[PDB]
Amino acid sequence: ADAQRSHYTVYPSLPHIPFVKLLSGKESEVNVEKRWELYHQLHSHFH
């Protein structure tokens, strides 16, 4: 049992932005992508 050990490395299996759809799920995906790009262009401009 790896839970009974000190440190163990695992490799997850695999078979893309963290922004969610607003307006109770009625907002389009293009508005989500635009909001992502606008957040990054303000964030980079500040930093």
Next chain:
Amino acid sequence: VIRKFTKKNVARAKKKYTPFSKRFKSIAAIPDLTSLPEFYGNSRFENKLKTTQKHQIVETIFSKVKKQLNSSYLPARENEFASIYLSAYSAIESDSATTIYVAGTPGVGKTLTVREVVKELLSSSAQREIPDFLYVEINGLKMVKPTDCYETLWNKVSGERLTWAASMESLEFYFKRVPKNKKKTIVVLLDELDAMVTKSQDIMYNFFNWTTYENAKLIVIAVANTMDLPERQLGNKITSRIGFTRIMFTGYTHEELKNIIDLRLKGLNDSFFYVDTKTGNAILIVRKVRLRMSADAIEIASRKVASVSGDARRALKVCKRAAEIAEKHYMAKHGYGYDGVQTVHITHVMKALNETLNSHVITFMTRLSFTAKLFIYALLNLMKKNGSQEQELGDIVDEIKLLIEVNGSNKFVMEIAKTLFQQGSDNISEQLRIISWDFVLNQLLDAGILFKQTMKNDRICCVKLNISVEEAKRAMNEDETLRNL
């Protein structure tokens, strides 16, 4: 490259790292090690300590006696000899591996008996009643490191020089895997076994676990101080492997010590010598001088030594010291330098025996100065009043001051108070310590009379007597001044 420290005195031995288990292809490929040139042992420094003598040195009558009583040059060890010889002979004859445990007090003839057993076994193997064997002797106190035993024994077996871990695996492989028809019996004496005890007991377990192996053909004679050394300092595995049948070397009785000394002095006691009166040189067969050492003196020396220790070294040294005392008196009275009846008497034996019995502690404290005696006396007063067995140094300072100022009508104190507190001088102020205060403190610490605590405050540092109180009082009762007050 800039080095953070340097080790510029490294002395590394030319010892290889490959063990015996990796120099042949298999177990069945190992050749017969008995028919090998380097295996089983098949002095260059003796010339360096020789010089030319250009004086005829004068050996008196007592010189042969004193050379005779040396430990370097067995009436009482016949059952221990029989037991060790029977066990070793049975293990050599049957190709068996075994342990023989021997223990005893110093000087009771353990090493001598084991070496005589080994010499008699070699004599038996010379005329072919037992198979040939190798003899290895390992003293635990003659090793720089305890693991050097691993380096020693393998070097006596194979003739190779390896490091200690590689030697240990080589010995393990040789004892476990090499067949008995391919090897030779080895008898190893482990002398001073308590010096081979480590914190993890690796060497002890390895040496007594190789004896439990079938193919080993190893006989280990382990010589120790006490019977209960495995039961005190070793684990239950090593105590189980050593065994239960353990051989006691008890101390000698006075008859045995007397027989040992008489067997030393067998040819020269009650004998005749040709002695040149001008020089004192004695020649065994100008005056014919009859030499004797009395049996009563030897007897009581044997009785005293046997009651104390049973040590043959001590009895031989007491007799040799008596002979030295007699020779010193003889050369004093005859005017003999270094280039009808001579008797080593009983008074010389009693002078030799009492010389290690007279105590110089009271004699030393009797001949100290007045200030050291005053220190000891004030310390005894503090131990009398407060009863602590450890007194502060400031308390000793104030008690010395009080003893000076109370007995200020004593004539000696009136004559010496200016010496203790001004060194007999005007222009020297009244001092807080007496003159030679730290001198007598360090003198009593050097002699081992006192113990001083490690503190940097001089007043509350404590001082304890290391000797008994009555001999200190006795020494204080000899002095005429400290008796009066």
Next chain:
Amino acid sequence: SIFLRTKALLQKSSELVDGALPARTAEYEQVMNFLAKAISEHRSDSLYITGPPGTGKTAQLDMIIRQKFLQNLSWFELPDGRLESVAVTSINCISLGEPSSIFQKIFDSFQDGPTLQIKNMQHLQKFLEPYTFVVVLDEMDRLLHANTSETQSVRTILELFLLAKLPTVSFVLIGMANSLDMLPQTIVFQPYTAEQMYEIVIQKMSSLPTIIFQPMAIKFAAKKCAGNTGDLRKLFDVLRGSIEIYELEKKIGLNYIAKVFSKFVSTRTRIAKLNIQQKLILCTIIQSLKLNSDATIDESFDHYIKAITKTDTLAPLQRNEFLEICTILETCGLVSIKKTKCKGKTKRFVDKIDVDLDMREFYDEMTKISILKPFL
């Protein structure tokens, strides 16, 4: 001769003569049940063998790998019985330098080829991962770390054990350890009793033509070598000593077993061999040790002078004469002189007197003498 052959069989190094020990059938069957369960199902598990010294754990397991069995690959017969290839090795742990190197010792026991550095169990796990393997760790009590907190001391050993409880690894651990010196399945080897030792002795010298021992002598030796911590090595040494005593004085009976047990094994006789000066010193030593119990020779001599002056029995003697009588009682066994460090404000090494004699027999011997009764 028959005596030399009997002593050769009675050594600790003698050859063990289907493949089970005479008095160890149940443990042998349990070990084979473990091996048949782990090898056929190809499971990862861990065995742990407990016992007192000389109970036959090493002998039975060496019998198992000798009879019933990439180097160390051996063919093994199942209870079903097709075949199996299994890498079984037996690593003694005292020959290890470091306890953390055992994985490397596990690796070098199996390979020829490549040589890769193993400093943890992970390299061992990835080495054994693409493949079963049995390691027999004898004297595994060496694998505990000294001067290390409980946790870090058990540190390596559970890494030996938890890898034995991992899926998809082909690892079987059989760890034989001594109980007296110190989850996996535990097998205990109980110390032998008298009938088991009798059966072992008769079966082990069944090779010899003529039995030189009497049977009741062997039963008496087995009964005397029994109870808690029952060692078969002790029985072998007792029989070998009986043969040695017999041929030194010249069948073997009860009297020679008693001769061994009296030869190789009391404070009433020690006191009785003393004069009145030495009995006086032994009385003042014990009286001084009631008051202090950490008292030097000078403090023991300190008490003796005060006891004389209130009694005036015998002339008072010097300090070095006192230490000589203490050396005489050291030789007699009544006194045990050690040098240890005192534990006051000033710490140095001092010599102090210890007594371990029986106090019940001390008061009986001294109350008969009237002048010594003030000194109790």
